[PDB]
Amino acid sequence: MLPPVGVQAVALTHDAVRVSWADVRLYTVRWRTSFSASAKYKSEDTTSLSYTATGLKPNTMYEFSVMVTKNRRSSTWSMTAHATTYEAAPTSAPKDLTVITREGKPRAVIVSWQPPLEANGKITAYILFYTLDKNIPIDDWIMETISGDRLTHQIMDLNLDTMYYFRIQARNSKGVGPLSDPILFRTLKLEVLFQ
Amino acid sequence: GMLPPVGVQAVALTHDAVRVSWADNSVPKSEVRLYTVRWRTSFSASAKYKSEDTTSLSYTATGLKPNTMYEFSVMVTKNRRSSTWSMTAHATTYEAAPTSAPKDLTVITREGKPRAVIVSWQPPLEANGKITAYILFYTLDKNIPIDDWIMETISGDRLTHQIMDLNLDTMYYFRIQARNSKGVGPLSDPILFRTLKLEVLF
Amino acid sequence: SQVPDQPSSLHVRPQTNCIIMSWTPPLNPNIVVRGYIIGYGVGSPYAETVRVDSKQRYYSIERLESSSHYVISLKAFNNAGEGVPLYESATTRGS
Amino acid sequence: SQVPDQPSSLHVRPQTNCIIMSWTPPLNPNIVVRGYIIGYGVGSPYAETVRVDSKQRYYSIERLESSSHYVISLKAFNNAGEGVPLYESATTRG
């Protein structure tokens, strides 16, 4: 039989994409992550001229193909349609948060991290929280906003021999992901620092 | 004649928010310095700014136009003495779902082959981003809801679409809406097009 | 002696490549009818034109394309001229 | 006969360009003290070094840069060597 034509795939939500083609005959629609190792498909059957592929990973590009079947006779697969699903707030937190004293200038540290695994989109900005107090809530810490293109930041004029707390989170076009777990960094005292 | 702040950085957050952040090489350690932050649409007629005052080293510019480029400048003021504005930092806000509907939806019979029309429209005024696709609904029935019309998906770069195999002497209804990387705008107003009968056409 | 009227009724029964027409003379018997003029085409009844006897009620159109929208006209005529036509839309049955 | 102890107390009173030190001799009087060796710099006490009399308790550091984080060391010394230092952080007023 003749495969369907005018196949187009349009992203709805961040996990839904609606394929739509033009021509009882049954249509089968297959899809697959275009950038992955698994060369295996997922598919579903319908009798409408459209179908919504759901349960997808956000900010990901998918390829869609439709065939038609009627009375034991199946057609070949149609031209593939490409669709990228919408973005979503990050799910993980930034990883490997590290604080190291800057040499040879004490009272200042260089904070280094790595982007989150589940960014679910392009990271617009990083938010870095740090404080001296053990009790005050997160919204009263010192806040520093670093661009998404930077993975390091310089903090200056800290206190000597004092325990600092560090929290970092990733932002995104549709919101901000969860904070990481606290990182404890103790600035050294001059006695230990010089030998 | 004070020193203007340096290392001024402007980072777009949402589609309506941008966070400016600067540094001052003059902050000691009794007196507190006030920072003034200005912003403005870089491509506009109005050479006028909006501004706000803070004592922090950062500020969030809100209530901005989406998919638009803004320019930001910071100065510092202390005891009657103002500095010059720092170098400008540019930031472009992210996209958002369209708010208006596509305009001037047009349906005209294709000559000289009846039963087929060419539907023409124009992009929405408030697109708030790059239009990925148009969704065109049309039906023969007066009563069925929008989700049971005939749906046609046109690419965002095209402003025309061809519908074929219509019925002769029948009233058709047309609806169109624009989608976008961040969502879908509202449907347009109904367009009434009456296909002609063979008697009148010849 | 005068221009004839339009035909009373016109029926079409499309085939896979043929189309069969069935009609009846004008409801007004006073006016003389010398014959009928049939026209057909795609989206236009001017493409093809045949003229048949006044006593014929059926005509079979041949060699038409499958799955197509044809337009058929029918007019009665006499020595005065041609009468107002009847129009009918017919769709060929696909294979 | 041996290296002296660390000073008992050290106080600093930073100015806009000066920094004033006030200290007191080691708690152990038996060990001889020939004098005190002061060190200062930014983020390091190795940058500048002066040595003063055993009878001094006050010293005024001059010609320092305004609004900076200085590190000050203080050690007592005698014919044996140098004793364990005392450290103090002081910040200049801008």
Numbering used by the authors:
A (entry chain D): 838 to 860, 872 to 1043
B (entry chain B): 837 to 865, 870 to 1042
C (entry chain C): 723 to 817
D (entry chain A): 723 to 816
Source paper text:
Deleted in colorectal cancer (DCC) is a single pass transmembrane glycoprotein that was originally identified in humans as a candidate tumor suppressor. DCC belongs to the immunoglobulin superfamily, and the extracellular fragment is composed of four immunoglobulin-like (Ig-like) domains followed by six fibronectin type III (FN) domains. Located between the functional DCCFN4 and DCCFN5 domains is an 8–28 amino acid linker, which is contingent on the particular DCC isoform.
Here we have undertaken a structural and functional analysis of the DCC construct DCCFN456, with a 22-residue long “artificial” linker composed of Ser-Gly-Gly (SGG) repeats (herein referred to as SGG-22) between the FN4 and FN5 domains. The critical residues involved in the netrin-1 binding to site 1 and site 2 cluster on either side of this hydrophobic ladder, respectively. In the crystal lattice of the structure we determined, four FN4 domains are positioned around one rod-like FN5-FN6 entity. We then would like to propose that this configuration of FN4-A-linker-FN5-FN6 molecule might represent a stable “resting” state of the DCC receptor.
